[PDB]
UniProtKB/Swiss-Prot annotation:
1-alpha repeat start and end residues: 11-51
1-gamma repeats: 95-127
Protein name per Swiss-Prot or TrEMBL: Nigrin b B chain
Glycosylation site list: 63, 71, 178, 232
Location of the Ricin B-type lectin domain: 1-126, 129-254
2-beta repeats: 181-219
Disulphide bonds in the chain: 14-33, 55-72, 143-158, 184-201
Length: 257
């Protein structure tokens, strides 16, 4: 069974076969998302991912290997299989390396690299090529809110008119300030009780998040989850902390009008 989507990643750019060429070996790159065929990827039940009738192919299975388009029947079988872990990676099972956008820029060429759970290794398979804009509702039904670059995020009463409560959920698995999309929700370290702040998006593992089935917002590198510190909204501190299932770690997205 097959279905076709765009693949959105770093900075909301899409996986794109360079210059629309279908020549074997043409690299994959980032490019602003659109409907062109070299950005439409068909996911088949054989774990191939195809554009223009050819396969996404690792041109080698080493750290730093380029990913290219290549004829599905003549490519090495190992090199054309991909899986899509629930946290938003795109992994080549043979090598265990993951598809990575090493720079934010358009025309950055995609590589297989060691998985470090970086936001540069986050992807979203979707027909909607725009970030989803939502409030993030958590403990006491309050809303997560940003408060400027380098400052903490924290909880406030939900307001339809508070733009700092509006989050752009980007395809690279970053959570960005909707009005200032260069800025990312960032853990300031990977240890329990490190503080969650807003920092310039830099593709880092500290800027990657996963909304899991238990209502947690998980930082995959650390394993830890967003937590309203001490269940005390007046502290105005959100930290990462091990998942406990407690109310101060439950979150819902609510789409904004
Ligand atoms: C896989 O390729 C990665 C990207 O080139 C390597 O990480 C890079 O290692 C550089 C040192 O050679 C270092 O200056 C870069 O900052 C770093 N880049 C990133 C995005 O992490 C990786 O190298 C290993 O991991 C890094 C973090 C260092 O610890 C290196 O000393 C390691 O060798 C490559 N993996 C391997 C096994 O070589
Ligand atoms: C992938 O490479 C295959 C092997 O070279 C191509 O199949 C070959 O296509 C030739 C010209 O199209 C044709 O003379 C050969 O009979 C055939 N060889 C084999 C082993 O099937 C293949 O081309 C696609 O498949 C063939 C059978 C035709 O349907 C073509 O029109 C197809 O494009 C290459 N696939 C692609 C997408 O280029
Ligand atoms: C989130 O931010 C985006 C990006 O700035 C806002 O989207 C813009 O909205 C204006 C007015 O509707 C449009 O003319 C632009 O086309 C939009 N730009 C983009 C890039 O989408 C959006 O209004 C903000 N708020 C919400 C709720 O999405
Ligand atoms: C909650 O945080 C505030 C602000 O620092 C503090 O005054 C208060 O005593 C804290 N503890 C509880 C139990 O609310």
């Amino acid at each position: 069974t097959s279905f076709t989507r765009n693949i959105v990643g770093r900075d909301g750019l899409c996986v794109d076969v360079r210059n629309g060429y279908d020549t074997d070996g043409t690299p994959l790159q980032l490019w602003p998302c659109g409907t062109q065929r070299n950005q439409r990827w068909t996911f088949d039940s054989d774990d191939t991912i195809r554009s223009m009738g050819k396969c996404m192919t690792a041109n080698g299975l080493n750290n730093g290997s380029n990913i290219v388009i290549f004829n599905c029947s003549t490519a090495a079988e190992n090199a054309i299989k991909w899986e899509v872990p629930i946290d938003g990676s795109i992994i080549n099972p043979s090598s265990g390396l993951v598809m990575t956008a090493p720079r934010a820029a358009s025309r950055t060429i995609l590589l297989l690299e060691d998985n470090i759970y970086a936001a540069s290794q986050g992807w979203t398979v979707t027909n909607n090529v725009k970030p989803i804009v939502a409030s993030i509702v958590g403990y006491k039904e309050m809303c997560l809110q940003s408060n400027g670059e380098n400052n903490g995020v924290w909880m406030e009463d939900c307001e339809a008119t508070s733009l700092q409560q509006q989050w752009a959920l980007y395809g690279d698995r970053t959570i960005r300030v909707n009005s200032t999309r260069g800025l990312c929700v960032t853990t300031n370290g990977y240890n329990s009780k490190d503080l969650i702040i807003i920092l310039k998006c830099q593709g880092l593992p500290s800027q990657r998040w996963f909304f899991n089935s238990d209502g947690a917002i998980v930082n995959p590198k650390s394993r830890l989850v967003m937590d309203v510190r001490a269940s005390n909204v007046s502290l105005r501190e959100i930290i990462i902390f091990p998942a406990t299932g407690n109310p101060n770690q439950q979150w819902v997205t609510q789409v904004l009008p």
